[PDB]
Amino acid sequence: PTINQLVRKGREKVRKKSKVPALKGAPFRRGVCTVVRTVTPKKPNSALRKVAKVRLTSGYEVTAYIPGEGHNLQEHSVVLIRGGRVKDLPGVRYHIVRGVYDAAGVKDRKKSRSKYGTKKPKEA
Amino acid sequence: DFEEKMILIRRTARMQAGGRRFRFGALVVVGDRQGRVGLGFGKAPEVPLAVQKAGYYARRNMVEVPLQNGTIPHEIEVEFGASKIVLKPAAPGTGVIAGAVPRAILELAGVTDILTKELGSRNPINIAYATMEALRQLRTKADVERLRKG
Amino acid sequence: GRYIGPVCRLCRREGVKLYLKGERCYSPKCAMERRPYPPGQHGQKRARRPSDYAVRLREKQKLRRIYGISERQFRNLFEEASKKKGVTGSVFLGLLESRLDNVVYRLGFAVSRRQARQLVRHGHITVNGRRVDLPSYRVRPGDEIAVAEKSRNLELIRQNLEAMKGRKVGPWLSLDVEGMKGKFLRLPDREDLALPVNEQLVIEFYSR
Amino acid sequence: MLTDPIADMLTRIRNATRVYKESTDVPASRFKEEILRILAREGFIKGYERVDVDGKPYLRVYLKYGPRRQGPDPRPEQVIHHIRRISKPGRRVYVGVKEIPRVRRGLGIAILSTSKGVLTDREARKLGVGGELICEVW
Amino acid sequence: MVKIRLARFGSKHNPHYRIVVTDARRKRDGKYIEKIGYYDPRKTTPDWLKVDVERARYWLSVGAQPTDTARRLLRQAGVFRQE
Amino acid sequence: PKKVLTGVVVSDKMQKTVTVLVERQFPHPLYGKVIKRSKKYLAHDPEEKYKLGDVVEIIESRPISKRKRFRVLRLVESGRMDLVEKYLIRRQNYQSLSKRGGKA
RNA sequence: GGGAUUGAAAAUCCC
RNA sequence: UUCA
RNA sequence: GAGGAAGAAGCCCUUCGGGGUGUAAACUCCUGAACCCGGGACGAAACCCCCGACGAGGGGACUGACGGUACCGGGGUAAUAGCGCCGGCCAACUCCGUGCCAGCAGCCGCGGUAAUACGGAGGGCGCGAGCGUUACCCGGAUUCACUGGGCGUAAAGGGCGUGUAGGCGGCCUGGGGCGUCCCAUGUGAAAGACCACGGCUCAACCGUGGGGGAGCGUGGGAUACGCUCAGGCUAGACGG
RNA sequence: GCUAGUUGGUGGGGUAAUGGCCCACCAAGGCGACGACGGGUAGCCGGUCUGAGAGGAUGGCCGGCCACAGGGGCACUGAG
Ligand SMILES: [K+]
Ligand SMILES: [K+]
Ligand SMILES: [K+]
Ligand SMILES: [K+]
Ligand SMILES: [K+]
Ligand SMILES: [K+]
Ligand SMILES: [K+]
Ligand SMILES: [Mg+2]
Ligand SMILES: [Mg+2]
Ligand SMILES: [Mg+2]
Ligand SMILES: [Mg+2]
Ligand SMILES: [Mg+2]
Ligand SMILES: [Mg+2]
Ligand SMILES: [Mg+2]
Ligand SMILES: [Mg+2]
Ligand SMILES: [Mg+2]
Ligand SMILES: [Mg+2]
Ligand SMILES: [Mg+2]
Ligand SMILES: [Mg+2]
Ligand SMILES: [Mg+2]
Ligand SMILES: [Mg+2]
Ligand SMILES: [Mg+2]
Ligand SMILES: [Mg+2]
Ligand SMILES: [Mg+2]
Ligand SMILES: [Mg+2]
Ligand SMILES: [Mg+2]
Ligand SMILES: [Mg+2]
Ligand SMILES: [Mg+2]
Ligand SMILES: [Mg+2]
Ligand SMILES: [Mg+2]
Ligand SMILES: [Mg+2]
Ligand SMILES: [Mg+2]
Ligand SMILES: [Mg+2]
Ligand SMILES: [Mg+2]
Ligand SMILES: [Mg+2]
Ligand SMILES: [Mg+2]
Ligand SMILES: [Mg+2]
Ligand SMILES: [Mg+2]
Ligand SMILES: [Mg+2]
Ligand SMILES: [Mg+2]
Ligand SMILES: [Mg+2]
Ligand SMILES: [Mg+2]
Ligand SMILES: [Mg+2]
Ligand SMILES: [Mg+2]
Ligand SMILES: [Mg+2]
Ligand SMILES: [Mg+2]
Ligand SMILES: [Mg+2]
Ligand SMILES: [Mg+2]
Ligand SMILES: [Mg+2]
Ligand SMILES: [Mg+2]
Ligand SMILES: [Mg+2]
Ligand SMILES: [Mg+2]
Ligand SMILES: [Mg+2]
Ligand SMILES: [Mg+2]
Ligand SMILES: [Mg+2]
Ligand SMILES: [Mg+2]
Ligand SMILES: [Mg+2]
Ligand SMILES: [Mg+2]
Ligand SMILES: [Mg+2]
Ligand SMILES: [Mg+2]
Ligand SMILES: [Mg+2]
Ligand SMILES: [Mg+2]
Ligand SMILES: [Mg+2]
Ligand SMILES: [Mg+2]
Ligand SMILES: [Mg+2]
Ligand SMILES: [Mg+2]
Ligand SMILES: [Mg+2]
Ligand SMILES: [Zn+2]
């Protein structure tokens, strides 16, 4: 555009949209499980991913992924949300943190223990 | 004498009844680190033959870089296709600040300090040519003198 | 806590012998002697062509693993270097050679740098007369680096300072094997050094 | 109507040297003539001369090039490789002597128009004055 | 009433003052009218007490009122010595 | 120094008061082109001296009324509605742009 | 749940 | 029919 | 810390000849964080008192929360290591388990039996009292482009005019100096940032000194270009 | 599109002091596309982070200014 046009209208700043409306930007947010279930992925995958509909304190009702080999969440578990998508499950934009609240870590896991929140086992 | 650095090797594909029939392309830089570089792009049925052919094409395509103590006499911008390249002179100690493609060319031309920038399309092949051409367009006071002297 | 683990293993990963032990890395046993290929279960297999990145890394890894400095520590120096006037590459090396623990080693009061360090952490060293236990302390030019007045009698001090009797040392240094004192004369130049490292690549690793 | 006579001149020159013309005319004006004095003195152009094409006053600009080259495409090198307008109607560009540009590390030039007359970046620096950054050439 | 007092700089356990001219009501370390000296209580360096006596004399002439500790230092540098 | 501005009187419809239009030129902070902005000041004319088309100097003064901190220092040049007209036309346009239109 | 079929599935067939 |  | 086998056991791998963890460990010698004993701070010299003049000046007395801390001397024990990665980007590979499952996944993508991508193990890479994760800001992003982009077919020329405001404006001369340029000068709090020396054993932290444009105000100056007022001109435009 | 204390005038009241700050009376005026009015959001700054720069983002700690002490209104005392 002409400089006069630029003088006249200027440029428009690029606003970014959040992919994690867990309000207050907040690094994490806690909620209660409303429904614990299984969902099937989209092409080209197949399985029974574990999801949970969480009622957040931010006043939101979003579905969250339950990472890990196995869990212990029912229709009343209080858990902490983390925020992280699951490529295969459209609509799942957050992860449930394992190791906090009613969400047990994952026993037996020995490698990426930090995530999945599993205490270091003693080696005798 | 001459040093060679392989910029990139790709495995292109073509169609025939029956299936795809491949070829390999290779970009090779050749320099004496004394102000002389050459670019060669050789293609062949096999990677080695490709590289070799490339090296061979490179030596046939040389440029005399007006080195002035590890740097370029002046700044220049050259667009080759949709790729643009920016070369800026730099004081010693600066180093060669460039992407892998211009670097390989600059280093073998015997450049030691230079500011650089890849703009537009960053296609290796095309950025490479933009570079050689930038170097090729470099002039010296001595040169400008003979030119405007007349 | 600087590293603290098997060293004649790092020499192996760098394909170049590093003096992390001192007098054993001299007598047919630095492992680099009869077994110079990298560590681990895949050490003798053919090495795939290294990525530009790989090279700039392993290189820095050599230069750092030499002085046994931590990445944090190391990086701060390089930065300080970048800032300062003059060729960052050389200057960076000058600063690295100015670490007390290092000079102590370069003077022969200790065999290796790991040992040179401990001699400093235990006050067995003295800069300009006062005791100093900061291995990262920066020796400026003109400083006298002696041995603890009360540590000259120490067994270990004897051997090293003994084998130092008659044995030229660094052109920027000066050892008075007598009073067990030395003198940081000048900041070494790249020329003064003969390190198996192309600082250029290091500067490039951080350039990224 | 011409909106930027200086830009027009800069262009006639640019355009003519690309086809390697002998001379090339541009409607005369004092200011243009001043630019030319510099181009001439700096050796980008053989020189210039006033003339009267069809009654009206023009300025024959005698272009200049390099020698024939070898290999395919013997076309000589340009003496004027680049010549671009900087300041322009609707976006004039001014500079303080402290803000005068160094075109191609001196291998090039920049013509400013100052209250002390039209001068190259060096001349300007010398009399320590800035002005409208007319254009650059190299 | 404007005063001449000590403003605190330096760090924890490392006090370093600034002999200052400032309105009585300012914070201790607030914006002052002028700096007229500096003082290091621990005498960590040879130069641990400087005072633009000429300026000091100026503010007194106009009404500056020195802290007791401030008056002490000003005198040590003969701000009052009339001999 | 009390500021002194220059402008054209575009109004006399007030008792002892005139509206002076003042233009200002300057390079644009970002796009550099010299742009021209302007403001209207209500100046004090005690003896109803100045009139439309007058180019006057205006000087910073002690308040005289809300929104009226300037007095007419002097007359630069008499009548010249070329400017008053320009301003009047400008405002004329406004008549259009809204819910309706309005012939150009 | 399983076998048939499949590269493995879906479908289909058989318990 | 779906992945490959 | 130094010395320590052609190299323990155990574990992993194997074309079973062997390879790897690995000088790593045992073990020898050496120094001695911790801890014990003793000494112990600077920060505090004023106010006040005496002499002298309630002044200037010598003199004098009181006063430490931090703290029995810092630091100093003596003695003195080998004394925490974790976390994330290893398909490509991206430094780092091999066996078993599992068979579109269980699961991984920043993007591209892995898993339907021989997975360097899932889980474990052995190795390895990277950091290290920390390492990962999530959230947010700038960068890369010339991906709002002033520096520094575009619109025939990739988003993208308004369906076409007319024309208001506005933006822009041939050639020559003169006046004025608005823009522009040049000196000088006043502002521009400290701190921060930059530079140089300094104080805590170093550093972090801190002090002193040095430089500081820009932005505005003021005074003076220049007049090529832009602006403005005057006059002139025909090559733009418009008439006959 | 906005505006009647709205815009200005004369005379008053008031204050340390200018002023539609407030009042009486007289004019009919003032602002707006160079975005008035309206809606949203928000204390501003020295500076901080980032960036080659131009920019972009930001205003914790420390320093400067402002505003407020459950929400609204109001004066008294006083140099304030
Ligand atoms: K081109
Ligand atoms: K001790
Ligand atoms: K269209
Ligand atoms: K003139
Ligand atoms: K009144
Ligand atoms: K802001
Ligand atoms: K800001
Ligand atoms: Mg812009
Ligand atoms: Mg969230
Ligand atoms: Mg799909
Ligand atoms: Mg799949
Ligand atoms: Mg994420
Ligand atoms: Mg290939
Ligand atoms: Mg040449
Ligand atoms: Mg292009
Ligand atoms: Mg692109
Ligand atoms: Mg440097
Ligand atoms: Mg042009
Ligand atoms: Mg050109
Ligand atoms: Mg420009
Ligand atoms: Mg009137
Ligand atoms: Mg009034
Ligand atoms: Mg007057
Ligand atoms: Mg209207
Ligand atoms: Mg079907
Ligand atoms: Mg599938
Ligand atoms: Mg050992
Ligand atoms: Mg002992
Ligand atoms: Mg004392
Ligand atoms: Mg004390
Ligand atoms: Mg007496
Ligand atoms: Mg007495
Ligand atoms: Mg007391
Ligand atoms: Mg790799
Ligand atoms: Mg993983
Ligand atoms: Mg398998
Ligand atoms: Mg694997
Ligand atoms: Mg992976
Ligand atoms: Mg695996
Ligand atoms: Mg640490
Ligand atoms: Mg970004
Ligand atoms: Mg940008
Ligand atoms: Mg974008
Ligand atoms: Mg642009
Ligand atoms: Mg584009
Ligand atoms: Mg289409
Ligand atoms: Mg299109
Ligand atoms: Mg289209
Ligand atoms: Mg069209
Ligand atoms: Mg149409
Ligand atoms: Mg004109
Ligand atoms: Mg100034
Ligand atoms: Mg300043
Ligand atoms: Mg300041
Ligand atoms: Mg020091
Ligand atoms: Mg300072
Ligand atoms: Mg005329
Ligand atoms: Mg009012
Ligand atoms: Mg306006
Ligand atoms: Mg708010
Ligand atoms: Mg950038
Ligand atoms: Mg940028
Ligand atoms: Mg504050
Ligand atoms: Mg309130
Ligand atoms: Mg209240
Ligand atoms: Mg009172
Ligand atoms: Mg009162
Ligand atoms: Zn070794």
PDB file of N, CA and C (backbone and C1' of nucleotides) and ligand atoms in Angstrom, chain I residues 97-99 114-115, ligand 36:
ATOM      1  P     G I  97      10.083 -62.200  23.275  1.00  0.00           P
ATOM      2  O5'   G I  97       9.097 -61.325  24.174  1.00  0.00           O
ATOM      3  C5'   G I  97       8.934 -61.594  25.580  1.00  0.00           C
ATOM      4  C4'   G I  97       8.110 -60.504  26.233  1.00  0.00           C
ATOM      5  C3'   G I  97       6.811 -60.167  25.530  1.00  0.00           C
ATOM      6  O3'   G I  97       5.772 -61.048  25.886  1.00  0.00           O
ATOM      7  C1'   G I  97       7.942 -58.163  26.065  1.00  0.00           C
ATOM      8  P     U I  98       4.731 -61.511  24.762  1.00  0.00           P
ATOM      9  O5'   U I  98       3.915 -60.186  24.419  1.00  0.00           O
ATOM     10  C5'   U I  98       3.223 -59.443  25.444  1.00  0.00           C
ATOM     11  C4'   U I  98       2.696 -58.151  24.870  1.00  0.00           C
ATOM     12  C3'   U I  98       1.923 -58.306  23.573  1.00  0.00           C
ATOM     13  O3'   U I  98       0.557 -58.604  23.844  1.00  0.00           O
ATOM     14  C1'   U I  98       3.504 -56.543  23.370  1.00  0.00           C
ATOM     15  P     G I  99      -0.337 -59.349  22.736  1.00  0.00           P
ATOM     16  O5'   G I  99      -0.909 -58.161  21.857  1.00  0.00           O
ATOM     17  C5'   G I  99      -1.677 -58.449  20.699  1.00  0.00           C
ATOM     18  C4'   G I  99      -1.256 -57.563  19.569  1.00  0.00           C
ATOM     19  C3'   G I  99      -1.613 -58.123  18.201  1.00  0.00           C
ATOM     20  O3'   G I  99      -2.008 -57.051  17.362  1.00  0.00           O
ATOM     21  C1'   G I  99       0.724 -57.784  18.358  1.00  0.00           C
ATOM     22  P     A I 114       5.946 -60.579  11.256  1.00  0.00           P
ATOM     23  O5'   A I 114       7.539 -60.528  11.317  1.00  0.00           O
ATOM     24  C5'   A I 114       8.241 -59.329  11.699  1.00  0.00           C
ATOM     25  C4'   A I 114       8.880 -59.533  13.046  1.00  0.00           C
ATOM     26  C3'   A I 114       9.686 -58.393  13.645  1.00  0.00           C
ATOM     27  O3'   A I 114       8.756 -57.463  14.225  1.00  0.00           O
ATOM     28  C1'   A I 114      10.741 -60.506  14.037  1.00  0.00           C
ATOM     29  P     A I 115       9.145 -56.608  15.535  1.00  0.00           P
ATOM     30  O5'   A I 115       8.829 -55.104  15.126  1.00  0.00           O
ATOM     31  C5'   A I 115       9.695 -54.363  14.233  1.00  0.00           C
ATOM     32  C4'   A I 115       9.956 -52.994  14.808  1.00  0.00           C
ATOM     33  C3'   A I 115      10.929 -52.980  15.976  1.00  0.00           C
ATOM     34  O3'   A I 115      12.297 -52.812  15.510  1.00  0.00           O
ATOM     35  C1'   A I 115       8.912 -51.841  16.550  1.00  0.00           C
TER      36        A I 115
HETATM   37 MG    MG K  36       9.567 -57.459  18.538  1.00  0.00          MG
END
